[PDB]
C-alpha positions as a Python dict, from the first residue, in 0.01 Angstrom:
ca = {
    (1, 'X'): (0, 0, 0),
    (2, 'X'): (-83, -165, 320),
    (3, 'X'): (-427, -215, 517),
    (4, 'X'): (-505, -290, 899),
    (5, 'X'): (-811, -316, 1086),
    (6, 'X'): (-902, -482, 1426),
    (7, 'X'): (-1132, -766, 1392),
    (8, 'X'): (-1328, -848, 1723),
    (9, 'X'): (-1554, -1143, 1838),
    (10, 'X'): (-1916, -1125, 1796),
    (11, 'X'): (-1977, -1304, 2139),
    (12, 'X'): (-1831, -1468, 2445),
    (13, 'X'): (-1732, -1783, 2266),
    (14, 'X'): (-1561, -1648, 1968),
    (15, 'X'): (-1839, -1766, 1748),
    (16, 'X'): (-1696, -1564, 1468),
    (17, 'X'): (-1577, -1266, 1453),
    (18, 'X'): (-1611, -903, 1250),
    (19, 'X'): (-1435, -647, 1103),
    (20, 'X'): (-1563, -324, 999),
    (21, 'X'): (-1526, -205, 617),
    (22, 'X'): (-1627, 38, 429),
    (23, 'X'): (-1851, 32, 121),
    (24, 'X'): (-1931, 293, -112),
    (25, 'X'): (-1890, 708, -98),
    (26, 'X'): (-1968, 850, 94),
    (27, 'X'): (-1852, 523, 309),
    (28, 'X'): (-2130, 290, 447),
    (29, 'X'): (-1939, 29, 707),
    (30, 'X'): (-2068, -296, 756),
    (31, 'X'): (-1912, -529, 984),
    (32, 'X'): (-1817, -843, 791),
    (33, 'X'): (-1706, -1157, 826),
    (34, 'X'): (-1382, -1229, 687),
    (35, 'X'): (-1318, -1620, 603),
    (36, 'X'): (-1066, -1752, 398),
    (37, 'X'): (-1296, -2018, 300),
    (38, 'X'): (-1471, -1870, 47),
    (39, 'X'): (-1447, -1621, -204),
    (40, 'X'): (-1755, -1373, -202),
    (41, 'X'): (-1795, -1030, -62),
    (42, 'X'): (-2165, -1006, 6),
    (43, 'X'): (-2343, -774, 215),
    (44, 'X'): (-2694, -723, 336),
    (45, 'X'): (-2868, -490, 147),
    (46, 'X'): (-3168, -262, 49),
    (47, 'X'): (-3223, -529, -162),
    (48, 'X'): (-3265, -810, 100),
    (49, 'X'): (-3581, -922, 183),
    (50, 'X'): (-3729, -741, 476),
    (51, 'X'): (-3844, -1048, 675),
    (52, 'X'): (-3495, -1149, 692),
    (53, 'X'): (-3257, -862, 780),
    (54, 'X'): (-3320, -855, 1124),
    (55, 'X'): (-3099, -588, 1303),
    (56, 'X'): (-2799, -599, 1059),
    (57, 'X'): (-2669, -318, 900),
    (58, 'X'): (-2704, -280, 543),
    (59, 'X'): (-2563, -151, 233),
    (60, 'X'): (-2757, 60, 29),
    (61, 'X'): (-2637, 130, -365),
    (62, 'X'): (-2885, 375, -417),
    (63, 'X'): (-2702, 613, -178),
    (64, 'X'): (-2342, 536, -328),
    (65, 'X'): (-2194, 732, -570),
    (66, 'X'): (-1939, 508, -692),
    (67, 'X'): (-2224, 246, -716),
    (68, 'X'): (-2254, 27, -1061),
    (69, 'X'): (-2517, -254, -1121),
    (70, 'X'): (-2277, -530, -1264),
    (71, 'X'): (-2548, -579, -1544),
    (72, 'X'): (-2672, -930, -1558),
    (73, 'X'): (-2454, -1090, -1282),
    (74, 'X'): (-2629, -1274, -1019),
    (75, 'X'): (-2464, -1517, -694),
    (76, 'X'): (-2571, -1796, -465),
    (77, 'X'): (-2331, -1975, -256),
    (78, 'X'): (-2409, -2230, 34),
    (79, 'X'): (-2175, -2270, 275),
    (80, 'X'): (-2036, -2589, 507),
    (81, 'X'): (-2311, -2517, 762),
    (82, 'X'): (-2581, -2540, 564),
    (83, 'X'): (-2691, -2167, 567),
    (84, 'X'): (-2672, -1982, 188),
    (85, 'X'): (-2749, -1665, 26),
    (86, 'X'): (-2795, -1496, -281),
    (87, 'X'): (-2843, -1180, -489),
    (88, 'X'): (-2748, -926, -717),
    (89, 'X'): (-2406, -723, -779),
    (90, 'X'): (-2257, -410, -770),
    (91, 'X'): (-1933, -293, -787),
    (92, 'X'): (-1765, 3, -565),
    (93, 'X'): (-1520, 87, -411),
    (94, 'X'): (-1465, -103, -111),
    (95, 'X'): (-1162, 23, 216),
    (96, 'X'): (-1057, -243, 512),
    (97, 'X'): (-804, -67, 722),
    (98, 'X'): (-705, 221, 520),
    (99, 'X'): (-673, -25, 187),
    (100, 'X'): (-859, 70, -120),
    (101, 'X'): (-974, -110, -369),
    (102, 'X'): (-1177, 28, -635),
    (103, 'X'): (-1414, -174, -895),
    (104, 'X'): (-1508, -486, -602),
    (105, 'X'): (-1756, -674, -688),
    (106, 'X'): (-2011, -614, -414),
    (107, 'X'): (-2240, -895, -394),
    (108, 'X'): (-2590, -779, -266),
    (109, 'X'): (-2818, -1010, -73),
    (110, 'X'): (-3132, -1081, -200),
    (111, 'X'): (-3171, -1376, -4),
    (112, 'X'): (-3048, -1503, 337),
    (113, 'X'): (-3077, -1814, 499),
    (114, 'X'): (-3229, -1812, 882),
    (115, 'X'): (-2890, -1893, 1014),
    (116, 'X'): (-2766, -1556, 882),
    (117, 'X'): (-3081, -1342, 952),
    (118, 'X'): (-3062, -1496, 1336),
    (119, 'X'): (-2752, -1357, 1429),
    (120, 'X'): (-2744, -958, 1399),
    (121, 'X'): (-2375, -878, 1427),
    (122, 'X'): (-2266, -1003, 1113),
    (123, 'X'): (-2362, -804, 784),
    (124, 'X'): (-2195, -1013, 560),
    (125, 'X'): (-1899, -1216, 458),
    (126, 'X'): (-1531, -1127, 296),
    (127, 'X'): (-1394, -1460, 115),
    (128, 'X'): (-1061, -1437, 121),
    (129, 'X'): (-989, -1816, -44),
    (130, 'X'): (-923, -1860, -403),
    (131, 'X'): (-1104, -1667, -661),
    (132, 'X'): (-1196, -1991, -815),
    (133, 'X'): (-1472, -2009, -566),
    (134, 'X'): (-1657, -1721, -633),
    (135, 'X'): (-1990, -1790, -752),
    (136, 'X'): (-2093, -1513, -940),
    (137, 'X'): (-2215, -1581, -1294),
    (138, 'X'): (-2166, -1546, -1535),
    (139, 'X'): (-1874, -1353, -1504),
    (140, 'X'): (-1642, -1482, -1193),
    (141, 'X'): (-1528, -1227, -972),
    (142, 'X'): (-1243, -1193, -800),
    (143, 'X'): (-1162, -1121, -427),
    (144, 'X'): (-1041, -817, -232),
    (145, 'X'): (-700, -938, -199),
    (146, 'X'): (-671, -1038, -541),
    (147, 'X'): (-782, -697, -656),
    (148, 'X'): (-556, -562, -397),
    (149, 'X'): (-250, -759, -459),
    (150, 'X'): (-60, -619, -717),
    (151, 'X'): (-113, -277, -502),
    (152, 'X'): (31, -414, -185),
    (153, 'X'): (378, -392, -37),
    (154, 'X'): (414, -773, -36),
    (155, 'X'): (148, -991, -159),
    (156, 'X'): (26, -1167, 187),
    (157, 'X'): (-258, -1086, 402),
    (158, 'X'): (-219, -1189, 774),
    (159, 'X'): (-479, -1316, 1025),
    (160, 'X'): (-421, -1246, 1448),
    (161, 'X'): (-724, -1357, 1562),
    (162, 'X'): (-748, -1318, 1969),
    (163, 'X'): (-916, -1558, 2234),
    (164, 'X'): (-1138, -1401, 2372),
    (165, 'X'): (-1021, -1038, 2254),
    (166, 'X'): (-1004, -846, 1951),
    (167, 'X'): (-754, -927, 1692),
    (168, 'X'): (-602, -758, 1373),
    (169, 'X'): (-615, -852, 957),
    (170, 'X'): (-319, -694, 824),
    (171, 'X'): (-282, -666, 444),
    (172, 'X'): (65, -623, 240),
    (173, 'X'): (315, -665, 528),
    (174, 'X'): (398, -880, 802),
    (175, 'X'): (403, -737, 1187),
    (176, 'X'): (728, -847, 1326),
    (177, 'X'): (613, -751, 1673),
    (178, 'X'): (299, -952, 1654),
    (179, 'X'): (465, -1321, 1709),
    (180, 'X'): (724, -1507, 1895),
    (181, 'X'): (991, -1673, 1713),
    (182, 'X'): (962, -1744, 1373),
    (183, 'X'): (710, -1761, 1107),
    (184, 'X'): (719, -2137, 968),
    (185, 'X'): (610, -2151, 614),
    (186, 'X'): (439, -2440, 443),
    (187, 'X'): (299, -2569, 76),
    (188, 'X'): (-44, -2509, 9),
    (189, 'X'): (-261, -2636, -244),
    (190, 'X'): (-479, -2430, -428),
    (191, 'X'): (-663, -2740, -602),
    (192, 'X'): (-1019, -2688, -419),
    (193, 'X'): (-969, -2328, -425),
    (194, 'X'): (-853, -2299, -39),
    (195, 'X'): (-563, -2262, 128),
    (196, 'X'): (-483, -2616, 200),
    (197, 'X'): (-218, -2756, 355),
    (198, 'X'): (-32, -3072, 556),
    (199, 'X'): (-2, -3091, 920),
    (200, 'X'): (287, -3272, 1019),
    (201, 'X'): (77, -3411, 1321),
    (202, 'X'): (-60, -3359, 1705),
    (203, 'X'): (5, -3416, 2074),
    (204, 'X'): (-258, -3392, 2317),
    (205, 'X'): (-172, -3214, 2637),
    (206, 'X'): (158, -3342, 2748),
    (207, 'X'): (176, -3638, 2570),
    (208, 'X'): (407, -3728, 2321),
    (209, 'X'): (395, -3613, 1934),
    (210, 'X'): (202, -3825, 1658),
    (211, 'X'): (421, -3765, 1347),
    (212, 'X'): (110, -3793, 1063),
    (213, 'X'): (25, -3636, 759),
    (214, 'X'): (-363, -3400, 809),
    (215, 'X'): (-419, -3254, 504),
    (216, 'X'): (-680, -2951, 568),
    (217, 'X'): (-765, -2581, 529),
    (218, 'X'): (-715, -2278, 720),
    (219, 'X'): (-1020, -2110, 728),
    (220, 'X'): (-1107, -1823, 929),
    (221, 'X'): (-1460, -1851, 854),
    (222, 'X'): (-1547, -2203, 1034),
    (223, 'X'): (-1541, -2148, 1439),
    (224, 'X'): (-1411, -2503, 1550),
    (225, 'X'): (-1117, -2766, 1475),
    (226, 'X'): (-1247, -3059, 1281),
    (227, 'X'): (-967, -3330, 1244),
    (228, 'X'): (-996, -3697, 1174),
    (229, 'X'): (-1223, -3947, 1375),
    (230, 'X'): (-914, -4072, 1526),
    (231, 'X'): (-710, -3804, 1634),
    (232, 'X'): (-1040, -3639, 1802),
    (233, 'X'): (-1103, -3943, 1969),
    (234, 'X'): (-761, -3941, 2129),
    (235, 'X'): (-850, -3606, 2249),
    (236, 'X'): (-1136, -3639, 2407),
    (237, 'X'): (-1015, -3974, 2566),
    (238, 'X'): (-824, -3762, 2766),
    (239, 'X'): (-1157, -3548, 2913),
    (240, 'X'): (-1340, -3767, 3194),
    (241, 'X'): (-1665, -3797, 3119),
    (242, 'X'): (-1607, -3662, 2736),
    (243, 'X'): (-1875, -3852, 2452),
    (244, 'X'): (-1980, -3798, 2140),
    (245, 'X'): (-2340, -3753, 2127),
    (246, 'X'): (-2535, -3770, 1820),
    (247, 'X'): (-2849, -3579, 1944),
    (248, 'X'): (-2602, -3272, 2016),
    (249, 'X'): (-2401, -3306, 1714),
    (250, 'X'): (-2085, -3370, 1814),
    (251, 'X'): (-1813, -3438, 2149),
    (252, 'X'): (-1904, -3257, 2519),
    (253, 'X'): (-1782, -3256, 2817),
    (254, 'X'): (-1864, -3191, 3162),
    (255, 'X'): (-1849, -2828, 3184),
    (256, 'X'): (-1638, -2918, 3546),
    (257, 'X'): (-1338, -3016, 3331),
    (258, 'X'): (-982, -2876, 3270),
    (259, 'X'): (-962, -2959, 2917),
    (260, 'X'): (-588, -3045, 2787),
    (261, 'X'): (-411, -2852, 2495),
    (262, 'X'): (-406, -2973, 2148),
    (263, 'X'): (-55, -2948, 1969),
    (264, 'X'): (-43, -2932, 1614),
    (265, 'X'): (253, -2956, 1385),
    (266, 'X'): (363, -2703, 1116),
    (267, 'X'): (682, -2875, 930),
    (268, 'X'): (912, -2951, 1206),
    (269, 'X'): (730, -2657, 1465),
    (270, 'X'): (463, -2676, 1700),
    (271, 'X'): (138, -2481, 1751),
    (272, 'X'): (-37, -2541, 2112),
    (273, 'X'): (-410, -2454, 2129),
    (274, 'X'): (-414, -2441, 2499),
    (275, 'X'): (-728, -2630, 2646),
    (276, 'X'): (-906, -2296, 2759),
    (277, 'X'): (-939, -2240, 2373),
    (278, 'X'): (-1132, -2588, 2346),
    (279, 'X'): (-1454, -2501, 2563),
    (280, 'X'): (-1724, -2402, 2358),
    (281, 'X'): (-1987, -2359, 2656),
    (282, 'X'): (-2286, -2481, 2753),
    (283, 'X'): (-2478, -2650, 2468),
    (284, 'X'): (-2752, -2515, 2629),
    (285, 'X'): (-2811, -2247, 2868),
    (286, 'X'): (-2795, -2371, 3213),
    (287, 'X'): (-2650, -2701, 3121),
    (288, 'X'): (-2353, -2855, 3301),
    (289, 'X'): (-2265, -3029, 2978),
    (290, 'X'): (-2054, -2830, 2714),
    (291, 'X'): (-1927, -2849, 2388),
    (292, 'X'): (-1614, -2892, 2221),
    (293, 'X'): (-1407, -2702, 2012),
    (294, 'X'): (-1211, -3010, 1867),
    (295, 'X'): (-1481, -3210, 1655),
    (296, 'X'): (-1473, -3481, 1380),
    (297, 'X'): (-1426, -3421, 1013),
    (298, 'X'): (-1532, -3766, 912),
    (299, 'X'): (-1872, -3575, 776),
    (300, 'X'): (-1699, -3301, 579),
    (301, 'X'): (-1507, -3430, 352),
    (302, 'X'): (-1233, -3220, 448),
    (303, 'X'): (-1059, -3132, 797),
    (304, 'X'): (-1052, -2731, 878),
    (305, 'X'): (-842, -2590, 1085),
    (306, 'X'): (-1114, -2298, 1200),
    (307, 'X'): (-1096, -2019, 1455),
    (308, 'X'): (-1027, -2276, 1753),
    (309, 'X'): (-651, -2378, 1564),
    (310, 'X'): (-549, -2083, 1357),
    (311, 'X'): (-616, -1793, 1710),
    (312, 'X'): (-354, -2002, 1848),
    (313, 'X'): (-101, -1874, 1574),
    (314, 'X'): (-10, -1559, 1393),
    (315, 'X'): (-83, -1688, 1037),
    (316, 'X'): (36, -1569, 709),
    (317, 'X'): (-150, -1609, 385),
    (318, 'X'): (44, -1573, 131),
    (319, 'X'): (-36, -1473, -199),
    (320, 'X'): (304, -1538, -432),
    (321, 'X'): (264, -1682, -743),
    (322, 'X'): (317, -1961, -584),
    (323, 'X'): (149, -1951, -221),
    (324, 'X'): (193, -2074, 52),
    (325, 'X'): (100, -2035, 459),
    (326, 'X'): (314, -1925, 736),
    (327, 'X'): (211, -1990, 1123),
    (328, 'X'): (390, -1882, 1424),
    (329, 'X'): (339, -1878, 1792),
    (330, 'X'): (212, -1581, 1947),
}
């Protein structure tokens, strides 16, 4: 089997963006968004409290026939942000793109965190790391591609995400008409349950190519690049007027600016995030100073290479025994 449905920015900015699926039968669809950092499907709900749904569209288990409490389990996950959630679970049968799988754990939302009840077009999340992250307990549950895999043509899912413009999640076969060139594949490490892997190193704009190890993730789910202190601040040395501020939260720039591309390295290829890709707007409306899309990780823990990096590329996840990622130009 194969699946493939269009996913589409929730704003101007690429903030995130959603994908419609469908829940239940008859078929509720909630737009969700999918991140390959982390590994629960959950969903607002009937069950979520009503002071924090707050335009969303939510699934209701009452009104699904294929519906099944998943007696006893319970979930609560807090993500990189600082926003959480947590609930109850069904199971159903859950479709993205004309892909079926039936028996998903469906985690309900009893709970949201402001962050989530704030912004109305997303009514949920697909994790799409590692089944080793999901939190449900006490019984971990696995993710729609794992229940899908063994179903699909080829065991990959692959992410086109657009600047600007919709994009397209294809599961169980690679489009051969949605890149340039060719796909370059690379070792991943499934130790933290993500799809980590080892950038080979950077250029900014013209300039010549750092050859450097930057272990990180690929995860579809955080908006913005966030690399080491010192390869950011070569960036933004390059911005006039560019600065880290701490009472913003991070590197802006005069909104006036051309902003330079950002090359990153895949094995011996080369992924260019071209500078348009970098401006994250206004930081707030009506000011002439705006934020970056390149940021530091050297508060993580980890660096992610978010929406900003991975739109740049047609990226492969793939799901073989042993997996790895694939990234192309586009």
């Amino acid at each position: 089997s194969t699946g493939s449905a269009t996913t589409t920015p929730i704003d101007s900015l690429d903030d995130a963006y959603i994908t419609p699926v469908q829940i239940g039968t008859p078929a509720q669809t909630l737009n969700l968004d999918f991140d390959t950092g982390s590994s629960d499907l959950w969903v607002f709900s009937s069950e979520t409290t009503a002071s924090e749904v707050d335009g969303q569209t939510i699934y209701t288990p009452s009104k699904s026939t294929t519906a099944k409490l998943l007696s006893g389990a319970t979930w609560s996950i807090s993500y990189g942000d600082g926003s959480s959630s947590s609930g109850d679970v069904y199971t159903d049968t859950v479709s993205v793109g004309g892909l079926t799988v039936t028996g998903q754990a469906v985690e309900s939302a009893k709970k949201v965190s402001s962050s989530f009840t704030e912004d109305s077009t997303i009514d949920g999340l697909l994790g799409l790391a590692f089944s080793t992250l999901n939190t449900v307990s006490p019984t971990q549950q696995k993710t729609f591609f794992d229940n899908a895999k063994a179903s699909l043509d080829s065991p990959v899912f692959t992410a086109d995400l657009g600047y600007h413009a919709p994009g397209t999640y294809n599961f169980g076969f690679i489009d051969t008409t949605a890149y340039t060139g060719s796909i370059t594949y690379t070792a991943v490490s499934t130790k933290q349950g993500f799809w980590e892997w080892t950038s080979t190193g950077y250029a900014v704009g013209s300039g010549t190519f750092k050859s450097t190890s930057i272990d990180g993730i690929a995860d579809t789910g955080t908006t913005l690049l966030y690399l080491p202190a010192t390869v950011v601040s070569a960036y933004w040395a390059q911005v006039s007027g560019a600065k880290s501020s701490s009472s913003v939260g991070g590197y802006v720039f005069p909104c006036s600016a051309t902003l330079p591309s950002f090359t990153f390295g895949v094995g011996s290829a080369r992924i260019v995030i071209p500078g348009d890709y970098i401006d994250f707007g206004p930081i707030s409306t009506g000011s002439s100073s705006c934020f970056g899309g390149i940021q530091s990780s050297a508060g993580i823990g980890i660096n992610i290479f978010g929406d900003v990096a991975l739109k740049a590329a047609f990226v492969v996840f793939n799901g073989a025994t042993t997996p790895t990622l694939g990234f192309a130009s586009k």
